[PDB]
Ligand binder design. Structure first.
Ligand SMILES: CCCCCCCC(=O)OC[C@H](COP(=O)(O)O[C@@H]1[C@H](O)[C@H](O)[C@@H](OP(=O)(O)O)[C@H](OP(=O)(O)O)[C@H]1O)OC(=O)CCCCCCC
Ligand SMILES: CCCCCCCC(=O)OC[C@H](COP(=O)(O)O[C@@H]1[C@H](O)[C@H](O)[C@@H](OP(=O)(O)O)[C@H](OP(=O)(O)O)[C@H]1O)OC(=O)CCCCCCC
Ligand SMILES: CCCCCCCCCCCC(=O)OC[C@H](COP(=O)(O)OCC[N+](C)(C)C)OC(=O)CCCCCCCCCCC
Ligand SMILES: CCCCCCCCCCCC(=O)OC[C@H](COP(=O)(O)OCC[N+](C)(C)C)OC(=O)CCCCCCCCCCC
Ligand SMILES: *[C@@H]1O[C@H](CO)[C@@H](O)[C@H](O)[C@H]1NC(C)=O
Ligand SMILES: *[C@@H]1O[C@H](CO)[C@@H](O)[C@H](O)[C@H]1NC(C)=O
Lengths: 450, 456
């Protein structure tokens, strides 16, 4: 019936970010976790959340802040020479213990402390992170394969290209730009009125898969030029079988895990809990769902799969069946390796840039930043223009920009693990320091929770 | 002040001039190139500023003239003829037509051109621009294919004699970047950002800014080859071995046949039709300006420079005011003439940037086209049509049939252009004038014809 038709849209909207994030994770973590592990985690946790989750509307999947934390912890472990996949196991153990502690007491008291200020700053930071990662990957591609006059005839291609290649960088840039352009034009077409309504909504729903298909075909019919493709195992296998297996031994894989890190892995668990709580506040709003999500993440850390987040009677059962089918098909997607291996990473990074740009649409901070470059009489009819003065609004925006810059600097420094703590430090900034400068009347308008 | 006011119209008359000169050099095998077009534009600009009745009309080369030059070049290369020498007799017949117009006025032919023919002509020119841009891109990709292995011992003295590693992809990137930067600057012009003065200032110079950005982007890329614009050293012919300055009638290399010297009146009629119709689009007293332009073109054909047409150009887009316009036109024409001395700047401009500007002009010429609007309405549902008179008073399928007949006319014109008998393209265009006047009243009633084909 229509259930199988509704399954397809959820499947594609849950698969394209899944494969994109799997590629990004494989690049950042030296392929220690890749597309296969993320797909297996998404499938298993989706099945469990569909069978026994409180709110079926929540889809459990990987996200940007989790990727940033994984990159930061990988950098920390490679700086201190630690077993990263084994440290994640103790992170999961401490997350489970924190889940038990939250269950014992009441965790709904801290929900109301998060306001629009922190959420908007967090989303803007995530969008900037996406854009920066896309452009950094483009710069690395152009650095690895420079535009030279003469290239070597026969370079080794078994692990990867060992030298510069003629058309790799320019074609990668073309593929990224074309993917982004087609996705944006399909989004713009979705809100237009150029075809019949059913066709318009259908094509706009599948804009990302259509753009991906177009650009993969474009690179497919180009024969002799090399582009970096997605690394997918043929079966239900670990990406890097040389580094890790399936069950990660908590007492070290190669060398013995130190006791000091075994006891100090509670602080990274606190950071993970803060990140998941903030993204749930952004999306979900529920302590049962948080219970389930963090518990499944802690359990999956033991088997090497990553933790995820809650990104967003008969009808409830229909949602149960829909979620179960989407999770099962996401799990079976790893068996479709001949298709996934032909997808260039340039298309995936174009989709990454598209997501980063389109996450800025509903951001009031982004609109208020755009108001910096307009004359004062072009401001829209929003309550934070007529009720507050222009320079007060600009000062509010400047303080938010200063907070964003401090967060970016903290991310850049080697102490990038403490980014969730610095991010959550903005809550007492709004509750304590902002009332000193601004007035209450200005603050309710600039920080309205509607 | 005038010294700052002339700069905008200078750039808006120079960028299409260099683009058309490069493209004419490509299609014409450098019989006429950037040097000839620039010299013709300067001389005719001076002579039209000093003697023109209406100074607001700028004199310059355009798309229909380029299509006519292509068609005549193909006709001359098909037969045994010198292409540069037939243009001399075309100019002679044009001067004779100018002499024969002052006797019996042609003001009665002005009323016969309506919105139908003008809109069809503009749409055809836009499609021609887009097709030429994409054909050049396809030829670039064919000359330098994406291969696994390239031979790096290739001679580059006349041109690259073999495929190059990454020329085609960089050319495509440059074309796309130029087009997108020009479109984004146009969109910024009609926006609400920045102080208003600056918005109009940067929006006015969107094309020069996009050209500068992309030329710099290509300039800082060192080891990659891109095809650059061919500009001579100074006041020199583009191809010195071909024609020279004073091209000799009655044959340069071989004997020019008498039958062609007598039958060159038909191409003169076709080019006069093209110039007259483009001047009609420009307008929407005038006899003096039109005949002066045609006479200057006929005289310039004697020295090898191309003929030009008239276009409406304003400053934003009594005796003192007309005198200031005189001085402005003279200064702009003199500076366009002096622009040929900037070889180190003009030779570093890639042709990909100019073709991006060509695509930009082709796309942006479609903005005020009512035929384009009704083509866009072919896809919208009937409830989304705007409140224009040709929708409220005209049934939906009636105007769809009107647009379909116009599309059929456009397809016939395209087939004629692709046909080797492409010289007769303007005449077929004139066939759209009786079609509105004779056959359309048989199908549509008078009310729907007045609504769809509105005078203004
Ligand atoms: C070559 C093209 C020839 C076309 C000639 C024939 C063109 C022609 O006659 O239009 C009919 C059709 C739509 O007609 P039509 O209005 O009856 O279709 C829908 C109908 O009106 C619904 O009631 C509307 O919902 P609502 O009650 O308002 O809520 C809906 O609006 P939306 O809300 O869904 O937008 C409408 O789409 O449009 C095309 O086929 C585009 C073809 C492009 C392919
Ligand atoms: C870049 C180097 C120069 C920087 C100098 C920067 C100097 C600077 O700070 O200007 C700020 C200016 C303030 O606008 P502001 O209203 O004071 O200035 C204009 C004035 O109000 C006019 O009266 C308006 O015309 P009108 O009476 O309504 O008809 C005109 O609007 P428009 O009608 O013309 O649209 C206004 O632009 O605009 C920005 O905020 C953009 C800042 C982004 C920076
Ligand atoms: C969505 C559109 C985004 C466009 C952004 C382009 C990113 C380019 C990154 C260059 C990194 C770098 O500097 O690379 C350095 C390498 C050499 O490497 P090396 O000498 O070993 O160091 O230079 C090269 O061979 C390439 C020279 C730079 C080419 C830039 C092309 C820009 C096209 C712009 C189209 C709008
Ligand atoms: C808005 C700016 C323009 C955007 C459109 C670009 C059109 C490119 C035309 C390519 C076809 C062609 O030219 O293919 C012809 C060539 C030559 O083939 P050969 O075997 O040597 O032929 C010998 C006779 O094929 C190729 O080597 C394949 C080149 C494929 C390039 C694909 C680029 C995709 C760009 C997508 C941008 C969103
Ligand atoms: C797998 O892990 C080993 C050890 O960390 C590493 O050397 C290798 O590069 C990894 N594989 C890939 C494909 O990166
Ligand atoms: C100049 O003309 C000759 C003969 O027509 C032609 O072979 C040559 O290619 C032309 N020069 C250029 C630069 O095209």
């Amino acid at each position: 019936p229509q259930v199988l038709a509704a399954v397809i849209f959820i499947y594609f909207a849950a698969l394209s970010p899944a494969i994109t994030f799997g590629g990004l994770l494989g690049e950042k973590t030296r392929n220690q976790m890749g597309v296969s592990e993320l797909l297996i985690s998404t499938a298993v946790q989706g099945i469990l959340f569909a069978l026994l989750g409180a709110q079926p509307l929540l889809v459990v999947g990987f996200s940007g802040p989790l990727l940033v934390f994984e990159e930061a912890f990988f950098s920390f472990c490679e700086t201190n020479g630690l077993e990263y996949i084994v440290g994640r196991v103790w992170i999961g153990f401490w997350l489970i213990l924190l889940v038990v502690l939250v269950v014992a007491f009441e965790g709904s008291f801290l929900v109301r402390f998060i306001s629009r200020y922190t959420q908007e700053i967090f989303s803007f930071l995530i969008s900037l992170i996406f854009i920066y990662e896309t452009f950094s990957k483009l710069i690395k591609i152009f650095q690895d394969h420079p535009l030279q006059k003469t290239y070597n005839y026969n370079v080794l291609m078994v692990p990867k290209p060992q030298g510069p290649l003629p058309n790799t960088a320019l074609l990668s840039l073309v593929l990224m730009a074309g993917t982004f352009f087609f996705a944006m034009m399909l989004r713009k077409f979705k809100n237009s009125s150029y075809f019949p309504g059913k066709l318009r909504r259908v094509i706009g729903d599948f804009g990302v898969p259509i753009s991906i298909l177009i650009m993969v075909l474009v690179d497919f019919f180009i024969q002799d030029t090399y582009t970096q493709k997605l690394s997918v195992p043929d079966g239900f296998k670990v990406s890097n079988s040389s580094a890790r297996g399936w069950v990660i031994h908590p007492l070290g894989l190669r060398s013995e895990f130190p006791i000091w890190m075994m006891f100090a892995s509670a602080l990274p668990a606190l950071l993970v809990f803060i990140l998941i709580f903030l993204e749930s506040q952004i999306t979900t709003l529920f302590h049962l769902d948080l219970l389930l999500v963090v518990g499944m993440g802690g359990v999956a850390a033991l088997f090497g799969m990553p933790w995820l987040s809650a990104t967003t009677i008969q009808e409830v059962k229909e949602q149960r069946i829909s979620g179960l089918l989407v999770a099962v098909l996401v799990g079976l997607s790893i068996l479709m390796e001949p298709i996934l291996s032909r997808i260039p990473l340039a298309v995936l990074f174009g989709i990454f840039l598209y997501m980063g740009v389109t996450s800025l649409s509903g951001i009031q901070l982004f609109d208020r930043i755009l108001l910096l470059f307009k004359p004062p009489k072009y401001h829209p009819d929003v309550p934070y223009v007529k009720r507050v003065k222009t320079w007060r609004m600009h000062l509010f925006t400047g303080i938010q920009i200063i907070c964003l810059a401090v967060l970016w600097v903290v991310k850049s420094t080697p102490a990038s693990l403490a980014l969730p703590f610095v991010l959550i430090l903005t809550v007492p900034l709004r509750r304590v320091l902002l009332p000193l400068i601004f007035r209450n009347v200005e603050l309710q308008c600039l920080d309205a929770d509607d």
